Design a protein around this ligand. Structure first.
Ligand SMILES: *[C@@H]1O[C@H](CO)[C@@H](O[C@@H]2O[C@H](CO)[C@@H](O)[C@H](O)[C@H]2NC(C)=O)[C@H](O)[C@H]1NC(C)=O
Ligand SMILES: *[C@@H]1O[C@H](CO)[C@@H](O[C@@H]2O[C@H](CO)[C@@H](O)[C@H](O)[C@H]2NC(C)=O)[C@H](O)[C@H]1NC(C)=O
Ligand SMILES: *[C@@H]1O[C@H](CO)[C@@H](O[C@@H]2O[C@H](CO)[C@@H](O)[C@H](O)[C@H]2NC(C)=O)[C@H](O)[C@H]1NC(C)=O
Ligand SMILES: *[C@@H]1O[C@H](CO)[C@@H](O)[C@H](O)[C@H]1NC(C)=O
Ligand SMILES: *[C@@H]1O[C@H](CO)[C@@H](O)[C@H](O)[C@H]1NC(C)=O
Ligand SMILES: *[C@@H]1O[C@H](CO)[C@@H](O)[C@H](O)[C@H]1NC(C)=O
Ligand SMILES: *[C@@H]1O[C@H](CO)[C@@H](O)[C@H](O)[C@H]1NC(C)=O
Ligand SMILES: *[C@@H]1O[C@H](CO)[C@@H](O)[C@H](O)[C@H]1NC(C)=O
Ligand SMILES: *[C@@H]1O[C@H](CO)[C@@H](O)[C@H](O)[C@H]1NC(C)=O
Ligand SMILES: *[C@@H]1O[C@H](CO)[C@@H](O)[C@H](O)[C@H]1NC(C)=O
Ligand SMILES: *[C@@H]1O[C@H](CO)[C@@H](O)[C@H](O)[C@H]1NC(C)=O
Ligand SMILES: *[C@@H]1O[C@H](CO)[C@@H](O)[C@H](O)[C@H]1NC(C)=O
Ligand SMILES: *[C@@H]1O[C@H](CO)[C@@H](O)[C@H](O)[C@H]1NC(C)=O
Ligand SMILES: *[C@@H]1O[C@H](CO)[C@@H](O)[C@H](O)[C@H]1NC(C)=O
Ligand SMILES: *[C@@H]1O[C@H](CO)[C@@H](O)[C@H](O)[C@H]1NC(C)=O
Ligand SMILES: *[C@@H]1O[C@H](CO)[C@@H](O)[C@H](O)[C@H]1NC(C)=O
Ligand SMILES: *[C@@H]1O[C@H](CO)[C@@H](O)[C@H](O)[C@H]1NC(C)=O
Ligand SMILES: *[C@@H]1O[C@H](CO)[C@@H](O)[C@H](O)[C@H]1NC(C)=O
Ligand SMILES: *[C@@H]1O[C@H](CO)[C@@H](O)[C@H](O)[C@H]1NC(C)=O
Ligand SMILES: *[C@@H]1O[C@H](CO)[C@@H](O)[C@H](O)[C@H]1NC(C)=O
Ligand SMILES: *[C@@H]1O[C@H](CO)[C@@H](O)[C@H](O)[C@H]1NC(C)=O
Ligand SMILES: *[C@@H]1O[C@H](CO)[C@@H](O)[C@H](O)[C@H]1NC(C)=O
Ligand SMILES: *[C@@H]1O[C@H](CO)[C@@H](O)[C@H](O)[C@H]1NC(C)=O
Ligand SMILES: *[C@@H]1O[C@H](CO)[C@@H](O)[C@H](O)[C@H]1NC(C)=O
Lengths: 491, 491, 491
């Protein structure tokens, strides 16, 4: 009682959180934050990306000009959304390398179309079908021109169209395969028919195949769709002796951030940068578990459902430096104004006071880690397909393997990052506690002794102002040294 | 001799192991474990994966029904093993996109076949050849039906088969290319021949090519093999005016964990989860150097032949805290009951005793690291091919580049992991030594002085029980303080 | 003045460098080195890789034997350089899967050609054109043999050539597509024409397409180029009823480190291991920002423009251990002979002296890090294409995605490496300072007190030799203990 006690300590909480570290699967810290986004609000926000809901139409149908898709003419988009309910209702068609055509249009991000005046002298234009009804009349694909005989003759066509513009042109055309030699005659007079479109660089030669296929909406015949790109200075050349489904012009083709996504999520009136087929997701977190398919500024897809980053010290209720969970037996739940602090007992009573500088030093370092991880996602746009409806073999094996490889490597990065940062966070918070203890020890010089539990026995009368002077670094040890030495060194 | 000495220390071994760290290429630790599996026992264990040894047959041969492969009918597998000795002994055939067909069947993991009654009215069935002898009789592929003329006519076929099941059907069929116009006539009457198989979604139109090719087992003619998948609600339609090698039914096609592997390793009667073409390998280690081609729960392939993870402290015979290989001059080889401990000299003699708590604290942290690395491999099944017998160009360049990219990234991860963990292991073991020293120092209060080499000069008579009380944390410094102070502070 | 002062400290510099760490975006260290190579000298060094400047010729042109490329006959290369100015000046041609042919030849790394004596009995050889003029005479591709009718007949060819060598043979051949039925007759007599080349394993059947295409240098007709590889024991078989552009022999095909690169950088007379299309770059740094396309022992391509690795301590003008930027208020700019040292004040004056052992300990650890990062790049040769002149869709999407995935993963590795190493460098340098302070403290025993700012108050007369004895570890505390204790413990 000619003595005082000053104890160093740290806070603790009743509701701790378990995190993983390098050396321990399960360690409790005072606070943590989740690094994996695991939920979507279920809506694709219409902002800030230009969304185009395909609704009942696929991109290719909107491209060809299925009557149902007339409203999509010349539209642009950042992201085209294809619905699973979509269906075609014009003339039955197939596209060799459908996936590539879908991909290049999606990436181009525009349906801008310019009509061109082709010289179809000698044939009937604007062929039409009951399989493709527009305004209650028999019709056809808006962007295609079905040519037939005129006066029972189909002269050999040799039609040309130069690109004298400064942009590429995307031409879509097709070949008709009648189900009977009869229909072939009726339509084109010729028995066979043959199509050949050329540029200076390319040749696409198609020979139609007369034959009945299983009926799609009662049609046993087909149209096969092809595309050719013509750059400035080049020339399109169309030779046909029949069966040619002619283009009415070209599509502008652009390069940019556009893409396409399969999803049944409704479009919402809201604003979110990251889109998944499940809906838009927040992008504050560096990782996400929602979908490997994404568009925009998105967290990276990982396999883990949760990854907790410690944002506080080890929680010790009741480190490499050995203070926290070390010579300091436990934390103080009653310290709610700081992370580290002092408890004292003197002549005037018992008190507690937080140390702000050490508290802030720990918090600044943790915020530095958070600044590296939170709100820094990277933009991805058009990628590769990652779900498949049909078996294809080799190329699909490769696309799947590439994505699986990527996810495992990011899942590894995420796992190690959290384990490493957490080990370091627990060590830096232990370090700050140790520094405060060491600083206090040096301050007291020969006037006190370390009791080994984070407490100092102070060998002199130390009232509240004296204790306060120690806490704020103005303690003058020389003032008390004589009193202290006499108390320490006696019998 | 009115004094005692208490020394803090750590163990050492005569047979140390060299490891790599962040700051040092070559540092000796007391113990380490290997992280790269570099050997196989040379056998593919038949458990716990269902192995199917192709022996003399390739998967495609077993699929088509080469007589040699009759025993493989309707078999399933987790892993099909193709031998380099395998050879075909039926009718000469090629498969366009052979690799894709092989891949999709392998992945399906079943040869389950259901016969279907096709209406081949107007043609001769069960065509047969001396190139494909079964039970000493001329025969053919068990799953294929060779159609020829009947009464010197081959009427146009238009055969249909609907899928009214709930599973997909895999149809295998082929086209015959006779080596002479003569054989073409003899077999099909028609001069040309043409095959066309269709679904609602697809058309495969093949025009046979009459001509002699270099003879395979004395046959200058060929059969080209094709496949079509028909989903529920869809319909197969076969038009042929000749040269059609007909299917006798369909294969069930499944999705699962099945795959195929090229290997000449014998099948063994044993149990191992990871299979490589070199044989099965243990999967206790996280990495392996045996083969980039694997199946099952396997360590990840890396380029390093060895990667040693330290599992003990730095070995100092004769860290950031500066105790081990620091102010403690060397380790104690004679300490074999613990990692850290005390050596003393007093009136009763000289002794040594291990400290169990600090020993266990270090061991627990190292075991925590091991638990993260040992026995946690990840299952891979069907992947991409990684060895190639023929030049292909673009697609093969891509498959090779993908695998090479993946291996370099995992080899990096493995290298950094070991360097980081080892640096940390050496630092945590140094830390535990420092904590024990600091704890002991505080215990002794004013009764001892640090001699600077991990030893304390104790300024009072301290018999064995006194030394023991220090080691077990029951030392009461107040008991000796007067004696100690008088000894310390004199002239 | 019956006392002395000994201060521990570290150096500082006026020109510090900002680096990134785990906990801080911007921290100043005494020195750093750049890890990202961002510049090229603009030349492709001709050493030590065998460079072949294509100049006006593409690889395929040199392969076919465009007259302009005669000088390239039988050349080999490690790297073939294609110029953007290159142009073809022989007969107009296209190659289906051009990219694959270009790739396999580039990778083979040789134009070694062996002539073979084919039996072209019944046809005219050495066909020739005004579209391909050699030495001012009408000519043709040096490696191809244009066959035409002889005496207005073109008999069915059935020509064979066995591979009885021990190496593979690469055969290049082609099909001619005349622009008129007239030219077809004039050249081959036959109305149609058909080509079929076979091996035991393969068949390539081409049917020429008569028709005019847009004129390339006034030619409306084309030659389509094909290749076939024939292994030892196999046989090439050529059937043609017309339009066959015949091979004159085979190319040797090798496997090795060769590749091809598009670049307009001049070839220089110098020596560099890493080549980019921008020019050769130094490979001392682990990363580079110059080009994702590389050949040789090259730093890895990353997205960051700069990544600074700290190679010195924190710069404090005017860590987890709390010495540097901690209880030591600031560094000493006047200490230029070491990183750590002593400053003293005694009866004889004030002095400064570096500590070499602690200085060297820090430097050795930093050099250990540098040794892991500097001068250890990995060799890559033939890879995948990474820039594209035409839209292709699916396969190109995959090639782009693979490269983008790889770069992001390496960019991550590089970012984390620097942040981690820098945090550790700052901590190890702080640690060395702390160790020196602790060692000095123990040396002084009871003869001095820690003033809390890295300085010791020494409680006895300590001349220059005495101070020197402390710095070199020969200080005998017992010599001064009586004097010191009397000074410390008084009133
Ligand atoms: C080839 O076979 C198919 C199947 O029998 C025929 O297609 C059917 O034709 C009938 C009437 O002609 C339709 O009512 C069916 O809906 C069709 N079925 C399918 C699946 O398309 C086809 O007519 C036959 N070809 C010829 C020329 O006879
Ligand atoms: C085309 O040429 C090949 C090679 O000369 C001929 O194939 C050979 O035919 C003979 C007997 O007819 C056999 O003994 C050889 O084994 C065959 N060689 C090969 C490599 O197949 C073929 O007959 C010729 N075509 C025609 C119709 O004459
Ligand atoms: C098909 O159309 C093209 C374009 O009109 C014709 O090619 C032109 O032919 C004339 C003279 O015959 C040349 O002067 C032009 O340079 C050619 N243009 C191009 C782009 O090639 C071609 O002649 C026509 N085909 C036929 C058989 O008449
Ligand atoms: C602990 O409780 C407080 C208030 O109830 C809350 O703010 C804090 O987030 C809780 N800790 C956690 C993360 O459970
Ligand atoms: C837990 O940590 C996060 C990130 O620092 C912070 O947003 C949250 O407020 C913290 N909770 C408490 C109780 O401090
Ligand atoms: C989509 O098609 C369905 C018919 O299945 C119809 O109910 C609906 O009106 C269509 N929506 C639009 C926008 O055309
Ligand atoms: C074909 O129809 C389009 C509108 O669909 C029209 O612009 C054009 O005049 C028609 N051409 C002929 C010859 O009927
Ligand atoms: C293909 O099948 C049907 C029925 O015979 C028909 O479309 C066509 O005539 C067939 N092909 C030939 C060459 O007869
Ligand atoms: C998102 O969709 C996928 C299926 O495409 C599903 O596996 C996953 O559970 C969904 N995620 C969430 C959080 O809804
Ligand atoms: C330090 O604490 C003492 C005691 O309360 C007080 O008198 C003084 O204002 C404080 N000094 C500073 C600089 O904060
Ligand atoms: C050292 O020797 C002992 C027994 O001979 C053995 O258990 C230990 O593994 C050895 N250390 C190594 C890894 O060489
Ligand atoms: C070396 O370390 C490994 C892993 O902890 C252990 O299995 C082995 O027993 C150790 N050897 C010795 C001598 O302790
Ligand atoms: C495999 O083929 C060889 C002939 O090369 C023969 O010796 C052996 O009997 C065959 N094995 C089986 C199981 O058919
Ligand atoms: C064809 O052979 C199979 C057995 O190989 C038999 O089931 C079928 O009855 C035969 N059909 C005819 C018409 O011979
Ligand atoms: C192809 O070559 C051989 C020999 O002439 C034969 O199979 C066939 O007759 C040839 N093709 C034609 C169209 O004659
Ligand atoms: C495994 O096989 C590969 C060849 O496929 C060979 O390069 C490697 O040396 C083998 N590994 C072992 C450990 O046998
Ligand atoms: C501590 O050591 C002393 C001396 O041997 C002994 O008397 C006592 O049993 C020990 N106490 C405990 C709690 O282990
Ligand atoms: C600081 O200046 C010296 C000499 O002027 C120079 O050697 C050193 O590199 C400079 N530091 C940096 C990296 O700016
Ligand atoms: C800075 O660090 C690098 C690498 O250690 C070294 O080359 C350079 O000389 C250093 N500069 C100074 C001023 O020491
Ligand atoms: C390359 O072609 C150009 C013509 O554009 C010519 O000036 C130059 O001589 C050619 N170079 C060589 C080496 O043939
Ligand atoms: C064809 O020309 C080549 C040289 O270009 C020559 O070696 C060969 O003798 C010629 N053959 C004939 C039949 O003219
Ligand atoms: C293709 O177009 C041109 C002009 O008619 C010509 O090359 C050829 O005659 C055409 N094809 C047919 C089958 O007439
Ligand atoms: C190298 O070339 C690429 C274009 O291929 C360009 O983007 C980049 O700026 C160039 N880098 C340097 C350092 O010249
Ligand atoms: C230590 O320093 C003292 C004082 O200068 C000097 O006498 C002696 O040579 C030094 N000893 C050693 C071993 O360097």
């Amino acid at each position: 009682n000619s003595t005082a006690t000053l104890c160093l300590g740290h806070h603790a909480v009743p509701n701790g959180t378990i995190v993983k570290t390098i050396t321990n699967d399960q360690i409790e810290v005072t606070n943590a934050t989740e690094l994996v986004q695991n939920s979507s609000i279920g809506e694709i926000c219409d902002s800030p990306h230009q969304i185009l809901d395909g609704e009942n139409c696929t991109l290719i149908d909107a491209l060809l000009g299925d009557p149902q898709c007339d409203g999509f003419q010349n539209k642009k988009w950042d992201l085209f959304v294809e619905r699973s309910k979509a269906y075609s209702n014009c003339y039955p068609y197939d596209v060799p390398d459908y996936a590539s055509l879908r991909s290049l249009v999606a990436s181009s991000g525009t349906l801008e179309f310019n009509n061109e005046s082709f010289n179809w002298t000698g044939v009937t234009q604007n062929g039409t079908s009951s399989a493709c009804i527009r305004r209650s009349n028999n019709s056809f694909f808006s962007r295609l021109n079905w040519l037939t005989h005129l006066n029972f003759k189909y002269p050999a066509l040799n039609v040309t169209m130069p690109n004298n513009e400064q942009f590429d042109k995307l031409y879509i055309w097709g070949v008709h395969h009648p189900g009977t030699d009869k229909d072939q005659i009726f339509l084109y007079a010729q028995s066979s028919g043959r199509i050949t479109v050329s540029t200076k660089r390319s040749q696409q030669a198609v020979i139609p195949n007369i034959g009945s296929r299983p009926r799609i909406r009662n049609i046993p015949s087909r149209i096969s769709i092809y595309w050719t790109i013509v750059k400035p200075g080049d020339i399109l050349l169309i030779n046909s002796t029949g069966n040619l489904i002619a283009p009415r012009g070209y599509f502008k083709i652009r390069s940019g951030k556009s893409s396409i996504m399969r999803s049944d999520a409704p479009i919402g009136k809201c604003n979110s940068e990251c889109i998944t087929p499940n809906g838009s997701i927040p992008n504050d977190k560096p990782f996400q578990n929602v979908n490997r398919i994404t568009y925009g500024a998105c967290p990276r897809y990982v396999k883990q459902s949760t990854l907790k980053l410690a944002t506080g010290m080890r929680n010790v209720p009741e480190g490499i430096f050995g203070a926290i969970a070390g010579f300091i037996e436990n934390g103080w739940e009653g310290m709610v104004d700081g992370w580290y602090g002092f408890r004292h007992q003197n002549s005037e009573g018992r008190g507690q006071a937080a140390d702000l500088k050490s508290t802030q030093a720990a918090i600044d370092q943790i915020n530095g880690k958070l600044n590296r991880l939170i709100g820094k996602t990277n933009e991805k746009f058009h990628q590769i397909e990652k779900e498949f409806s049909e078996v294809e073999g080799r190329i699909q094996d490769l696309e799947k393997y590439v994505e699986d490889t990527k996810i495992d490597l990011w899942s590894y990065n995420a796992e190690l990052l959290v384990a490493l940062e957490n080990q370091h966070t627990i060590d830096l918070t232990d370090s700050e506690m140790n520094k405060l203890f060491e600083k206090t020890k040096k301050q007291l010089r020969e006037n006190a002794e370390d009791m080994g539990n984070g407490c100092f026995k102070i060998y002199h009368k130390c009232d509240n102002a004296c204790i306060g002077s120690i806490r704020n670094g103005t303690y003058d040890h020389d003032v008390y040294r004589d009193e202290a030495l006499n108390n320490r060194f006696q019998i």
